[PDB]
Amino acid sequence: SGPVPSRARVYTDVNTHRPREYWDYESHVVEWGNQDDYQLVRKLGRGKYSEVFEAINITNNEKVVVKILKPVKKKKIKREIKILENLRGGPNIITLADIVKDPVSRTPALVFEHVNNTDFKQLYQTLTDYDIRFYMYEILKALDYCHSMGIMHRDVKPANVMIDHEHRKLRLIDWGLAEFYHPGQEYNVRVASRYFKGPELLVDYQMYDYSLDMWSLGCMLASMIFRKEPFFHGHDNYDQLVRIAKVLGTEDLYDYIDKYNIELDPRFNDILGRHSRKRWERFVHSENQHLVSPEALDFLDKLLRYDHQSRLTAREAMEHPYFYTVVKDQA
Ligand SMILES: O=C1C=C2C[C@]3(O)COc4c(ccc(O)c4O)C3=C2C=C1O
């Protein structure tokens, strides 16, 4: 009657064998920096939860980025802080440089290293085959690191991957949806941007894990080598799963549903319809072919799998021959 349970096939117990203080962010005591070290220069963007500014550290005149956190649950604020501290120093993880507070009002803000990024809507149009391989490898380093440290990012998308292209510099940002993995825990499926949501999320399977990030990465990869961003473009969450089924096919989707004994909304049957699995080669045209290779398609095919347990891990992905030239020239 109920859905079959699942656990991560790698890094399953990394929080289990770490001390309580590592993952119990509720108990963490924050060490506050000095708010008056930073001057805001211009608003960079705003979410539902935060507003983000370019700023200057006036003690050394370095650029930073300041994210002022709206009146939300302190628990959510502490989770992001603990995660950023836990991951600090990891490869291509955005550095949390400081945590400050208006000393009179309650209002906390996170201070990050500045990345002089090129906007992905502009950058992706200009990347070469080698650039994509290089940057995908760099994202994989970050994901393997944070997974190995017991953390799911849960919001992997181009806007959260900052690239200073002239310095070949990449940082994975926005850890505000990130969460500690504990085996058997049922997580909120309302995470990730619509276009990067895994099948587990769209069918309301809550016992997911690190492999969610690997789907999102697969979605990014597709959008880059095929020059179609985003690759799966649904108008809502139901339609998002339909866009996926039109490429991956409905037969493998129903096998997935069957294996985990997942109960699908009645709605879904009529709209999912019946679709053959398409060959990846179908999305190759004159304009994107210089970015596509047999290795790329084989790699992509091993990321975009319905069954979260069958997707490559970050370490397996880094071993794929798609990256041979990158690994070779990084040793
Ligand atoms: O949790 C977050 C959230 C953001 C949002 C945002 O502030 C947007 O834009 C940024 C940036 C960081 C550096 C940077 O150079 C930049 O332009 C961002 C973050 C880093 C994080 O860890």
CA–CA dist 322, 318 (Å, integer): 9
Give Cα separations from 196 to 16, 113, 193, 216, 232 (angstroms): 29, 26, 5, 5, 8
CA–CA dist 81, 329 (Å, integer): 35
Q: Are 114 and 63 in contact (CB under 8 A)?
A: yes
CA–CA dist 215, 58 (Å, integer): 41
**What are φ and ψ of residue 81, in 5° steps?**
-65, -45
Q: Which residues sit opposite 71 in a β-bridge?
A: none
Residue 102: how many CB atoms within 10 A of its CB? 11
Domains of the chain plus CATH, in order, are 6-23+115-330 (1.10.510.10), 24-114 (3.30.200.20)
Q: What share of the chain is helix, strand, coil (3-state, %, to 5)?
A: 40, 15, 45
Q: Resolution in angstroms for this experimental structure? A: 2.1
CA–CA dist 280, 247 (Å, integer): 8
67 is in an annotated binding site: yes
CA–CA dist 161, 213 (Å, integer): 13
- The strand ranges marked E within the chain are 38-46, 50-57, 62-69, 96-101, 108-113, 151-152, 161-164, 169-172, 179-180
CA–CA dist 123, 223 (Å, integer): 13
Q: Which helix (H) or strand (E) holds 131?
A: helix 129-148
What positions carry a catalytic annotation?
Answer: 155
Residue 246: how many CB atoms within 10 A of its CB? 16
Residue 318: how many CB atoms within 10 A of its CB? 18
Q: Are 129 and 293 in contact (CB under 8 A)?
A: yes
Cα–ligand 1 centroid distance for 173 (angstroms): 6
Structure tokens of 85? 């501290």
- How was this one solved? X-ray
Structure tokens of 77? 């604020």
Angle at 69 between CA 68 and CA 73, to 5 degrees: 165
Look at strands 96-101 and 50-57 and give their pairing: unpaired
Nearest-atom number in ligand 1 for the CA of 115 is 15
CA–CA dist 137, 296 (Å, integer): 12
Structure tokens of 280? 């990846």
Angle at 65 between CA 64 and CA 68, to 5 degrees: 135
Q: What is the CA radius of gyration of the chain?
A: 20
Q: Are 146 and 93 in contact (CB under 8 A)?
A: yes
Q: Are 237 and 197 in contact (CB under 8 A)?
A: yes
Q: Indicate which residue's Cα is closest to atom 5 of ligand 1.
A: 174
**Residues whose beta carbon lies within 6 Å of some atom of ligand 1:** 44-45, 52, 65, 67, 94, 112, 114-115, 117, 162, 173-176
Taking alpha carbons only, the member of 133, 137, 131, 175 closest to residue 154 is: 175
Q: State which amino acid sits at residue 256.
A: Y
